[PDB]
Design a protein around this ligand. Structure first.
Ligand SMILES: C[C@@H]1COCCN1c1cc(C2([S@](C)(=N)=O)CC2)nc(-c2cccc3ccccc23)n1
Length: 247
């Protein structure tokens, strides 16, 4: 049949199993922001199991990883709003732990479905291209001195106006997640996200801020390292295009 349907049925079954864990009801449905009146002042990406299930049914998750990322938001949001050691956060973690047990149990079947949905996940040129990009991010860009502001998404709890100014945020962890999902098939698409980190620093911090000078160095070492690997990256991009057309 349709591998997206089979995949969605597996993911829904995992939701059924997490819904059955003790004390999980506060996560079954969206937070009521008219009761929890400051919730959206603190949380940027609300998530709950009902929304997760409805998204599975809308065929929004072509792989384990897109599903797990949304599930992990449930934990992160609780850690931010309720606290990292709050019983609610521990409860949300028990659901993520069960999901990970189930994904491990079914990893070979899930891998087959993911490849049938998106053959590029099995293409050795896509995999090699993504591996190189990840190494540029971890070994060069994240090694820039004082680059910590750009390693992770800004937490709105700590910087409350950040996302009112920056409506298209980007950070190196999000880029790594994109790489793991093989989002980038060329250097151009990778550089769209890298440059967004710098543009956001110019907008939020100013062009002459030390934050922006650091972001500029991150971008500069990215260009420098991509240039060093130009001939290999060009071959991979050509072969990825050929794989993409053949599908
Ligand atoms: C907004 C700022 C400039 O523009 C680039 C992004 N910047 C960030 C980013 C982060 C993150 S975080 C920890 N996940 O929010 C991602 C690591 N933290 C902080 C920050 C947090 C809490 C207190 C701070 C006090 C002084 C200076 C910065 C503070 N600023």
């Amino acid at each position: 049949t349709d591998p997206m349907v089979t995949l969605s049925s597996i993911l829904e079954s995992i939701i059924n199993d997490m819904r059955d864990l003790p004390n999980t009801y506060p996560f079954h449905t969206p937070v009521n922001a008219k009761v929890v009146k400051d919730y959206y002042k603190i949380i940027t990406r609300p998530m709950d199991l009902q929304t997760l299930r409805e998204n599975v049914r809308k065929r929004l998750y072509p792989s384990r990883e897109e599903f797990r990322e949304h599930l992990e938001l449930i934990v992160k949001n609780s850690a931010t709003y309720n606290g990292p050691k709050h019983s609610l956060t521990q409860i949300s973690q028990s659901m993520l732990d069960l999901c990970d047990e189930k994904l491990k149990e079914k990893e070979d079947k899930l891998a087959r479905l993911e490849k049938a949905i998106n053959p590029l996940l099995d293409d050795d040129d896509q995999v090699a291209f993504s591996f190189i990009l990840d190494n540029i991010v971890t070994q060069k860009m994240m090694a820039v001195p004082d680059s910590w502001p750009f390693h992770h998404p800004v937490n709105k709890k700590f910087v409350p106006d950040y996302y009112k100014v920056i409506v298209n945020p980007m950070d190196l962890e999000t880029i790594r997640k994109n790489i793991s999902k093989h989002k980038y098939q060329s250097r151009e698409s990778f550089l769209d996200d890298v440059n967004l980190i710098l543009a956001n620093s110019v907008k939020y911090n100013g062009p002459e801020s030390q934050y922006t000078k650091t972001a500029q160095e991150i971008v500069n070492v990215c260009y420098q390292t991509l240039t060093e690997y130009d001939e290999h990256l060009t071959q991979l991009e050509k072969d990825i295009c050929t794989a993409k057309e053949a599908a």
